[PDB]
């Protein structure tokens, strides 16, 4: 596997995040701080060229 799960419906996404709710309605949202990406940047670099 690798990305398969993300390809199950409108993969036109922006960012992953996960959360859970309590009976009283309050919820906790965890949004990991995505760092850089060599692959991503390189693609763009070459695209710039």
């Amino acid at each position: 596997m690798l990305l398969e799960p993300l390809l199950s419906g409108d993969p036109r996404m922006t960012q992953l995040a996960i959360q859970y709710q309590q009976y009283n309605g309050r919820t906790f949202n965890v949004i990991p701080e995505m760092p850089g990406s060599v692959i991503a940047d390189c693609v763009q670099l070459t695209a710039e060229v």
């Binding site: 959360q19 859970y20 709710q21 009976y23 009283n24 309605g25 309050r26 919820t27 949202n29």
Partner: protein
């Protein structure tokens, strides 16, 4: 816990008789023969999934009005001091029985004699009519409707709605029930609540009575933009993909992203559209209708006399001396209040707003040209047929089209949280 059951009939738009004639009544009773048209209304209107129109009934708001007139007329018969029910007609119509279960054509000997001379802006107390006072259930089922009527007849504007916020309402059973509605439209929901209400009239602080109240707030709090997918009320919020469009469709949905912190306490207020373009907004209407069902068993706060026309003041169960005020608004303008708000929270772009506002404009333009045009058609008729004067739609004035308080009430609602 309501104890006074009064309602108010409609007034003539400067006419000599109730704004409805035979041709129009026959059209209402076409498929059903009862004057309590809730059910039959909900069918025509068609889940407000497209602009509904007819020859005699051009808009939903028209049928709503007409339905009101028919009751305002016929009901004046059994509510006469003597309480006789089948001795006189009202335009060829007479009651089927003491229990007001339907109208039918008058017997020849009754058609022969004159009709009842109905009056305008009358206020009656159900408990004055035996058959209503003796069978509580019957009363409560029917009142549900007389209320929706009253809520339309108090002012020359649109149907009044009641918005309340109170964390104490949210109980176990409520939470359990609500979750089922995930995915249904405002209409789709209202439709059922109405039916469920008619079968087993709600109690004061009942499970349904509360949830229905909660739904209303959820709708409004979202209609104005205080709540949304990124700032929910206990994860709930109503969604609309085409805000502005002629026929809006709101969906109840979920979101765990955030749940706005709510202030403890109980807060409520009354809202009502003031612009004529309500005759073409199924949600704004049903919203009233629901607050209508609420009234059968619950006593809402009184409405400050100063917010309503003289004729409808000091009505024991409705208008009072030091009550809450009515908050009116123009449909178009609110649309912007809606956008502005979201854009400030950072969930909508300026471009998106423009795209919406633009449409919202085109929509108003259409709805107005039509309403005014049909309005004219009516007068044209009334001059040619002075004996059967009527109105396919509640009368409105050029002034009604302005903003006025729209913004003021836009914040009033936002204050409920």
């Amino acid at each position: 816990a309501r104890a006074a059951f009064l309602f108010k009939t409609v007034g003539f738009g400067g006419l000599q008789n109730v704004p409805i004639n035979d041709e129009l009544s026959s059209h209402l009773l076409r498929a059903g023969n009862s004057p309590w048209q809730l059910t039959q209304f909900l069918d025509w209107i068609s889940l407000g999934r497209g602009l509904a129109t007819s020859a005699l009934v051009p808009t939903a708001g028209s049928r709503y009005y007409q339905m009101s007139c028919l009751l305002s007329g016929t009901l004046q018969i059994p509510f006469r001091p003597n309480h006789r029910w089948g001795d006189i007609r009202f335009l060829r119509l007479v009651w089927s029985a003491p229990t007001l279960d339907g109208l039918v054509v008058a017997p020849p000997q009754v058609l022969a004699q004159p009709a009842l001379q109905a009056q305008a802006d009358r206020v009656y107390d159900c408990d004055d009519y035996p058959f209503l006072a003796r069978d509580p259930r019957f009363k409560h089922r029917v009142y549900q409707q007389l209320s929706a009527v009253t809520l339309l007849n108090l002012t020359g504007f649109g149907p009044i709605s009641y918005v309340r916020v109170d964390e104490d309402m949210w109980s176990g059973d409520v939470n359990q029930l609500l979750m089922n509605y995930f995915g249904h439209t405002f209409a789709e929901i209202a439709y059922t609540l109405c039916q469920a209400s008619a079968n087993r009239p709600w109690e004061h602080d009942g499970t349904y009575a509360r949830m229905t109240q909660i739904i209303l707030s959820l709708f409004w709090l979202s209609y104005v933009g205080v709540i949304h997918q990124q700032n929910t009320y206990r994860t709930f919020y109503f969604q609309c993909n085409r805000r502005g469009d002629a026929a809006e469709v709101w969906i109840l949905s979920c979101s765990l992203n955030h749940s706005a912190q709510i202030r403890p306490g109980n807060r409520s207020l009354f809202v009502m559209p003031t612009s004529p373009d309500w005759n073409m907004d199924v949600n704004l209407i049903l919203s009233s209708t629901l607050t209508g069902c609420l009234c059968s068993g619950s006593q809402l706060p009184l409405i400050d006399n100063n917010s309503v026309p003289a004729v409808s003041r000091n009505i024991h169960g409705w208008t009072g001396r030091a009550g809450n005020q009515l908050h009116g608004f123009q449909v178009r303008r609110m649309v912007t209040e809606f956008c502005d708000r979201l854009r400030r929270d950072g969930v909508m772009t300026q471009a998106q707003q423009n795209q919406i506002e633009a449409l919202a404009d085109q929509t108003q333009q259409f709805k107005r040209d039509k309403l005014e045009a049909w309005a004219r058609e009516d007068d044209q008729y009334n001059q040619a047929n002075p004996n059967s004067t009527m109105f396919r739609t509640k009368p409105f004035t050029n002034a009604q089209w302005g903003r006025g308080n729209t913004g003021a009430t836009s914040a009033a609602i936002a204050a409920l949280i």
